């Protein structure tokens, strides 16, 4: 069966990631960003009541998906990659954005791209990977033959700090946020190599969800009418670094 979301309250899980979901203190928390604007465009068209819930600070991406599958949220919206392993336990809406990953490194590092990680120019333990990201499964399939021998990272902040401290030489990061951060916040970090792991971001929903069609039709309408493109431009066009 199927139903419309009008008048229904949705508990919407979101996860910190600038400029998708930007968390500010003042004591109260304020949220802004692409995701918050997207929720408003969807709410206005669909008429649901939004109960927006920020995931706890240490939540991983795969942790957010698992929390939704456990019933902690009704949907989850963010820079959440659609993967085969995740699709076993949740459904995803039609895509809100294309995606791919880039290699992140300190400016000036003598890395040309992915071959240098797959040739062994960099020992495995100098490749940092954030646990519970889609990048972890890429690493395990493409670089290490299933061996869990990357340098483990608990957060974006640990990724940035470990690069700047010379503990790792590279990590992986989604292209949209990687460009944002390296063009606006960490001016001495940079990207290298071709894009890889072409993928999509989707809204996470329960499997076999009553409201699947209503959400999908509305996402596709926002795509067709240019709203998703406008939102991307609004939040991601900036380049502060000199």
Interacting residues toward a second copy by CB under 8 A: 1-2, 82-84, 87-88, 91-92, 94-95, 98, 137-138, 141, 197-200, 207-208, 212-213, 216-218, 220-221, 223-225, 229
The number of CA neighbours under 13 Å toward the Cβ of 101 is 22
- Conformation bin of residue 102: beta by default, left when phi > 0, alpha when psi is -120 to 50: beta
81 sits near ligand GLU (criterion: CB under 6 A): yes
- Whole-angstrom distance, CA of residue 199 vs CA of residue 86: 13
Two tokens, residue 178: 């990687």
CB 29 within 8 A of CB 53: no
Question: What is the closest distance, in whole angstroms, from the C-beta atom of residue 158 to ligand GLU in the complex?
Answer: 13
Site string for ligand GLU, 185-204 (x = CB under 6 A): --------------------
The smaller minimum CB distance to a second copy, of residues 85 and 187, is found at 85
Minimum Å gap between C-beta 214 and Cl ion is 9
Which of ligand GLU, a second copy, Cl ion, none does 1 bind, CB closer than 5 to 8 A by kind?
A: a second copy
For residue 14, the cross-strand partners are: 54
| Under 8 Å between Cβ of 201 and 82 | yes
Strands, sheet with 9-14, edge to edge from the N-terminal-most edge strand: 49-54, 9-14, 75-76, 204-205, 91-92
From 20, 61, 211, 235, residue interacting with ligand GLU (rule: CB under 6 A): 61
The single residue among 67, 129, 173, 219 that binds ligand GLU, judged by CB under 6 A, is 173
Tokens (6 digits) for 206 = 């329960």
Position 174 contacts ligand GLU (CB under 6 A): yes
Contact residues toward ligand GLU (CB under 6 A) are 61, 79-81, 133-135, 173-174, 177
Binding-site residues from annotation for L-glutamate: 79, 81, 86, 130, 134, 174
């Amino acid at each position: 069966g199927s139903a419309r979301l009008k008048g229904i309250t949705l508990r919407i899980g979101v996860i910190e990631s600038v400029p998708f979901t930007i968390v500010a203190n003042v004591n109260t928390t304020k949220l802004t960003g692409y995701v918050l604007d997207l929720i408003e465009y969807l709410r206005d068209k669909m008429g649901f009541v939004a109960d927006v819930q920020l995931a706890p600070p240490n939540t991983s991406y795969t942790g957010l998906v698992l929390a939704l599958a456990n019933g902690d949220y009704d949907i989850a919206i963010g820079d959440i990659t659609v993967t085969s392993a995740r699709r076993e336990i949740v459904a995803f809406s039609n895509s809100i954005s294309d995606n791919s990953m880039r290699i992140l490194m300190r400016k000036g590092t003598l890395i040309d791209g992915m071959d240098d990680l797959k040739n062994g120019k960099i020992p495995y333990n100098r490749i940092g990977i954030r646990i519970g990201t889609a990048g972890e499964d890429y690493y395990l399939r493409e670089i290490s033959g299933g061996s869990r021998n990357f340098y483990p990272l608990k957060s974006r902040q640990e990724m940035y700090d470990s690069l700047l401290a010379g503990i790792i030489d590279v990590s992986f990061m989604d292209i949209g946020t990687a460009e944002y951060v390296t063009n606006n916040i960490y001016c001495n970090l940079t990207l290298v190599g071709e894009d890889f792991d072409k993928s999509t971001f989707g809204i996470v929903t329960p499997k076999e969800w009553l409201y699947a069609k209503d959400l999908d039709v509305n996402i596709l309408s926002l795509r067709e009418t240019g709203i998703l493109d406008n939102l991307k431009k609004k939040w991601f066009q900036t380049k502060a670094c000199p």
